Amino acid sequence: YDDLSKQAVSYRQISLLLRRPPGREAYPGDVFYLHSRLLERSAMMSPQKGSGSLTSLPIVETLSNDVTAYIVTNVISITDGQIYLDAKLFTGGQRPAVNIGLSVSRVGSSAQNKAMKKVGGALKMLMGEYRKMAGEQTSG
Amino acid sequence: DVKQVGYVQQIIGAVVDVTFTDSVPPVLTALTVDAKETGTLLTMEIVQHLDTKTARCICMSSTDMLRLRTPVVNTGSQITVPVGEATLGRIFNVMGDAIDQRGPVKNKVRWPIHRKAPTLAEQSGKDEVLVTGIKVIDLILPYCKGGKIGLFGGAGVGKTVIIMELINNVAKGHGGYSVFAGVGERTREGTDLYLEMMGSKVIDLQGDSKCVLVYGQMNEPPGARARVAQTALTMAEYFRDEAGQDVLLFVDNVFRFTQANSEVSALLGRIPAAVGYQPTLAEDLGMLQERITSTVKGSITSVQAVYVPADDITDPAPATTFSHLDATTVLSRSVAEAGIYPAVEPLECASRIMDPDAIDVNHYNVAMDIVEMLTKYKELQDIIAVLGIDELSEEDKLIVDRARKVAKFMSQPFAVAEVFTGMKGYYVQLEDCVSDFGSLLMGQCDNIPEMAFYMVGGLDSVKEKAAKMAAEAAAMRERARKAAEAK
Amino acid sequence: NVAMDIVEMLTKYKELQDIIAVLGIDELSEEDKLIVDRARKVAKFMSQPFAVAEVFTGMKGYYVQLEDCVSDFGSLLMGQCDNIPEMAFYMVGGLDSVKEKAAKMAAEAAAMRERARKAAEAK
Amino acid sequence: GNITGLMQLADYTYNKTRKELITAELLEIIGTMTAMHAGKKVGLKKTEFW
């Protein structure tokens, strides 16, 4: 989905043109249901149903690195994880601009192949140390 | 065949409602009433049906002295605008009625204003580069054909001279005309911009002009100003499709294109979503931008000035505009006061086509190296003012020389102002420019002094200036030596 | 009484954030920076792992009993444990687990010095 | 550097709160206008149906 933040603007048009009572950030209030109908249809189905899947990587636009926006938190309140790209790093050459601190995957540990699970453990510890050792010195 | 007639039924400001006795015309359809009644011609476009026979229509002029239940003529279509060679060197309002007093316009056909956007098939996914001729732009900020560009400039930063030069270069390089769109333009600047196009011969009245002008002024209601950019862009789609060529589309501040539509949505009664911008913000803005695209048949590029209210990028009008832009030609008064013209600040600028998947590899690596260089020069500039140049190593002071050379080399003259200031202008190509910066980057042109790169174009052109400087200083020495030796 | 004093200490640490964020810890009185070095310890100690979040912290979860929760804060409040560094309190439960972790960090940190000595002598 | 880091957040929250205050005032006014529309009645619409 590229992207949901622009879907909400269209639904906002439809509501406001119908004079439905607005809410926070101009939105009606049933804008949460709008995305929950959509992202709950993603699932790893049961063996009773075929063990299929529907993975959903929605995209959402922030403003000046602000996860306190209404839509961003509506969707973090729905999704099974989070990937946070920072413009500070994208401008600073690092591309993809993932911030590992503000990023998380709530479920993928079970799915991560063991070959990658162990390497990920090592690098998670390493970056937990790098994140601290890079800031504590502050050029001291 | 006959023509349809309707009757007014209410007037509230710019808004007007029109009863009919038959099927109501389509939406955005223009409705004219003769000039004998109001005293002047009057057009209103349908926006919003209210019943099977009523049609709310926004009015583009003043509806003063308009009685009730007056006859109202259905044009049969929406606002048909002029198109063609005859459009050039002229000014047109929203309806295509020329306001420059310069007689009629001898056009053959007259196209509607709300043309649907190009289909996906008409598009060309291949991202191309517009050879602007301005090395500062071409190196760091390649204007992508069929793309949207940002221009950030107040007063006294060479904004006018830039857009004038763009018109000239695209008229000769790509063989393509241009078009200007003054949305909410101060009516003083219309004169100060139409007369600069006489001294620069961008509008040669006794010859071949290059740009069309479209002024929707502040003295006009928002129903007009909102429908301006569609007019100036309809002028450009003729040159894209029929003439089969590339086009520029200059847009005085898009902020004032957004505000006007906000006002229309207010008058219609639509609930303002956010800070006060219409709920249809991205729709009304995107219906415009999506027509500004490349094609199999041509291209329309759009250099768009953007006002940022309160210097806040998070406001929906800038934020929605930025989602459509491709490059940002920032202008600064600082570099302008430092002698640089065009007054571009390359580091705070940015582009989207800067990717070797789009452009050739050399153009990319050279530009990224210049960005590295000038960034390092900014840091060392923060050190020199504190410590001193003698504090720096031998490796650092070399790039402190070359970065100064680069920044002075960005300074380019303009054929537009060739009469005003006297100096010639230089249309420098793309590939030649990359070899020039690659020479200045690989150090193979370091013996040349700094000031030789000031206000020149092309490495092949500065060397004449370097020789001129050396010859001049040698003549001053030969003058001083013999003036002192004679006595 | 312990909780009242913990909350009080953090109420002061919060007021000093407005300075530390601006100037630095080096511009604070000795008393003040001791409160800083202690409130940071309390805040890091408040953290602990849960059996549910083992996937994330990568640690087994502890179950801190109530009576063992107060003596630890009281020791950390009366200055009974200031030689311990700040990071030994991060993501543990019970001061016994701290002193284990502090031993781990001291061992690893010293081993880096003997290791760097051999890396320097061989170099 | 630190003061600038604080200044951007202050400018950011200042403008955030500014815009939210604007939106809120609008919705107050629209709430009142809408409530009055509910207060106003419908007419009769008497006309020949036959």
Ligand SMILES: COCCOCCOCCOc1ccc(C(C)(C)CC(C)(C)C)cc1
């Ligand atoms: C990776 O390629 C990116 C290319 O992006 C092209 C479109 O860029 C959109 C421009 O975004 C900005 C961002 C910030 C600004 C600033 C904050 C510098 C403007 C200012 C100082 C006037 C408020 C201007 C434009």
